[PDB]
Symmetry: D2
Subunit: 240 residues, 4 copies
């Protein structure tokens, strides 16, 4: 129970990676706050977690909308929930060839996938600093490092997340706060699947639990000397 | 004289790295469009270069205003200047501890250092593709790879520039367009001049060579990547920093 | 606790990082074979591990000596030990400015810190492949990636360990064998003033790490839940180098 | 002609990358010493260069053999040749699955591609430090950073080249010596000519443009790094691979 008395926030925790990350953290004793864009999903998350024997709280949050972010934190404040572990999982793609890409597609992805890390980390870091302990872990993507056509905006955001994290890691280190990125390759969440996995050494697409286990490792007290790092979980498709 | 038939666009070409870049490409025979915030500065650049016997145009361009970008590409269109080499020199810093950083300080940096590359690249790519030749080169920064406290905004933007360039390099490679980043370390410049004696000294402790770079160091790397002989280099980041950061 | 019935080999397990790694794997129920260069150290290791209620075997191995390696694998074979987890921990430094550096200082370091990786993995990979499960994890070093003056030989070796691992990862990935590198920064295990200064200036917290920091990371990679991580270098260095 | 009065050494300069590198350096003004494993290839080199109007010398070197290295440096010293620029281009593959790989296959590759770097740099670095100027440039491979199946020895070696080079960069940086690696991707050479039509085609799927590079591509990057205007670049790996690997 490494994480007894820690409170963890996992954005977009409804399904896939987010949920598994929420499951993995609760499994180590953490209290988990998960977010979804709708109330119904926030309830589905909450009941499903509490159903598996966990103390969880489902809350509404759209990380792309500063008003939502602002309301969100007023609520955890009202519910006396201090965040010790932040997992930036939520995000979106707006794929297009750069030449046809509109301002909305570019700006939406930068705003949702990059600025959101700044905005969420900004609202959690003072708490962790006072308590002299914290974890910030962001879900990146292999494409932030390898690049990918049709995704100039997504790759830019994802690379920026790493840059942000390396920089913040310097700022918060003296307070026992680590800041890291977990970069997934192809993860289950159409075959196509066969061809995709031929570009992957292991010959298979990963699963949400692959990402959750890495996030949970980085969030544990035993990864305290790991900061500013990018941990690629991708079956060898990209090796740094 | 690899670049005799080429037209280069250098943003913020008035002085420093921007100006040496202009000089460097013109030297190779390029016709160079340099951009500046003001008409006088733009005029100053043009007269400067033409004085040294180069083919040069200085135009007004503010890279944070979508409107200004729009007017600019219309003017070169009418002047029959199609861009073959784009050098993104633009960028600013608004340093602050992350916890204190304002929405303005964050968004300003992202917009001016990162979103600008997309905006400018988008206006030049079609012409290059049409001709099946192009160079896109963006001036990044050592902190984009190393990180640096007090610059979560600038580090995110500069790292983002690399991600953008990697991605774009794939889209345009078939049309013989390369996309690369030159990442300066500590270079003598107007910005660096601001720094105090102490913070100059501190940075000195991080440079194995014991030298502070000069704009020509950046210009040279840029001009090399712009040349035909760099055709087989794309999606790369070339660090020019005296050993401060080794990739 | 998934490591029950898994057999692990940690070279140079007598003390420091190797010993903590052996303790971490054992703690997950692995049977741990630890090696040392002397019989006294092998037994001391074994006795210590068994002392703590773990199953362990201490054997003699000089990873720099081919004959020693040949005898070693002859012995594990006669003891019916199939190696599921290989942790290449053992190594050495012969520091010098490049220009003064002897052929012998160069060769010894490449031989002990790089070639040993090839030689130990070559003796373990067939077993893993037949069972279709394996972990190879080598202890690298921050200097393999960052470089460090006075250590051209060591940096070359530790960078090569990464090259080897990436290549090997491709060859064995389909048989559910992962190959990774854990690269420690400064870890307390006799510090030079330079090292103390580097600690003070290059690590954001200014704190040196501990053997448990490296053991936890090795154990995480060795676990079934890291099945989808291969060809990677996990830096455990307090942020002194950020890849 | 920043290389007038400089002397460069290219190991394995008979053909392919080695020869174009020699050619590229001489074009910047360097006096070039090239090496071959045979007295006939050594002459052929010297003849070919001097034919093209260059000041060149070809000498025999079996770089796997320390005694040969010893005799070579004896020879250049007897001849008044002080090396300012060292390009380590010699190297071989012995591809096999790691599990089948012999000691010969392993050590031959480590010795030729990695140990040779130390041995040759050790013989040039003093004179460079004395003169307070030098370049060391090693030819790596993309697989050194990307990894490749069937080449555990070669990938190990070429990754070691980068580690060695970073380390050496710190030691010599203050004496104005830079140390860098140029890492070719898929370039037309003799061993490439030994690939089946199908192997070639398959590799093309890994390069964005789908183009195979040429020796001039590597020679151009090497000559850049060797030039004086590359003075602030050290400890770097410049990937020349058409986008096959982006770092």
């Amino acid at each position: 129970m490494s994480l007894n008395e820690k409170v963890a926030l996992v954005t977009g925790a409804s399904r896939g990676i987010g949920f598994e990350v929420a499951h993995a953290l609760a499994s180590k004793g953490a209290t988990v706050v998960g977010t979804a864009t709708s109330q119904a999903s926030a309830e589905k998350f909450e009941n499903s977690m509490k159903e598996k024997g966990f103390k969880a709280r489902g809350l509404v949050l759209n990380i792309s909308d500063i008003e939502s972010i602002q309301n969100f934190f007023a609520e955890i404040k009202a519910e006396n929930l201090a965040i010790d572990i932040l997992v930036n999982n939520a995000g979106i793609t707006r794929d297009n060839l750069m030449m046809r890409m509109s301002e909305d597609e570019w700006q939406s992805v930068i705003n949702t996938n990059l600025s959101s890390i700044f905005r969420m980390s900004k609202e959690c870091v003072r708490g962790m600093m006072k308590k002299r302990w914290g974890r910030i872990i962001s879900i990146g993507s292999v494409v932030g490092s390898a690049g990918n056509p049709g995704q100039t905006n997504y790759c830019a955001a994802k690379a920026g997340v790493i840059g942000f994290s390396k920089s913040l890691a310097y700022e918060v280190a003296s307070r026992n706060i680590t800041v890291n990125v977990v970069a997934p390759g192809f993860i289950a969440t159409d075959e196509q699947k066969s061809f995709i996995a031929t570009k992957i050494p292991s010959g298979q697409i990963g699963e949400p639990k692959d990402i959750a286990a890495a996030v949970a490792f980085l969030a544990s007290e035993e990864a305290k000397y790991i900061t500013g790092q990018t941990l690629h979980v991708n079956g060898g498709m990209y090796m740094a």
